[PDB]
Structures are given as structure tokens and as C-alpha cells.
Amino acid sequence: PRTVMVNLNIHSSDYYNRSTSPWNLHRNEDPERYPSVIWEAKCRHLGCINADGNVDYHMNSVPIQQEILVLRREPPHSPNSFRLEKILVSVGCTCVTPI
């Protein structure tokens, strides 16, 4: 147990709409976690948008997954005590050339 005190008081999305692998944001809620709200990226298409503005299945949109840390209420339902925990989240999409 390495217990520390944390003060939770903290003191373009239209540019990425031009991506060849565009994505939408999905709101992910968990009342036993801090942050309770996490916005997850979901690729709009299986393929990538080509030079003509059409979805081209010769390339694939893939989510960029990142490991992040979240606070898990410990004991469960605790409003003021937590344990650090690792989860995988989608932070955007990229276009890849298949194998």
C-alpha cells in the first residue's frame, strides 16, 4: 500500500473529421470508476476514405488502443478512497495497409 492524497479539483475534433479513417465518440460510463465518463473512439468505417471521397476497402480503419490508468473505488462504492487500475481505451483511428 503506497497511499497518497489527491485533490480532485483541477485548477480540433472538426479537423479530425477530415481523416481517411474517421471516428465517432462513444460515451463510456462506470459509477465505480474515476473518471466515471470516458469518451472512446469508434471507427466510422471498415475501409478508409480514398481521394474520391469514397470508402475504399483496400485499406482498413483501425482503432488506436492505449493503456490508461483509472481510479477504482476501494472498498467498492467508497466516495473517497481508490486503487489505481489499468484499462485499454480507443483514442482515435488510423488507416493501415493490410497484410
Added chain:
Amino acid sequence: PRTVMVNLNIHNSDYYNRSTSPWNLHRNEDPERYPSVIWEAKCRHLGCINADGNVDYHMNSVPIQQEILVLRREPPHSPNSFRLEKILVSVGCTCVTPIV
């Protein structure tokens, strides 16, 4: 002041190498922050890699910036007390068609 207790004991770019907007990782260190080490994505090219494996400058690789939370030592140098803080980090790269 919204002070909570946190147990820091966790219970426990090469993947996307085929991207048309590939990136490398850059190590960012700050001893006054938790995590002290943060890996930032840097786009390998200004343009995007086409089907032939050549860089095409009619499209741009752009870093995807996201707001993440970090712990800032408060008071400075404190080993056991922090304040939650927002920072902007580059999490990967995407290929965009420029504003024409």
C-alpha cells in the same frame, strides 16, 4: 478541496507500423508529475504513405491530441500529496485531407 486517498499500487507505434500516417514514440520525463514518464507520438512524415510505399504530400499525417489527467506534486516536491491536472498528449497519428 476534493481530497481523496489513492493506493498507487496497481493490481497486475510498432503495432500500427502499417499506418499511412506512422509515428514514433518520444519519452517525456517530469519528476514533479505522476506518471513521471509519458510517451508522446510524433508523426514520422509530413505526408501520408500511399499504396506504393511512397510519401504523398497531398495528404497530411497529423498527431491526434487528447486531454489526459496526471498528478502534480502539491506542495512542490511532495512525495505523498498531489493535485489532479489536465495535459494534452499526442496519442497517435491520423491522415487528413487538407482544407482546400
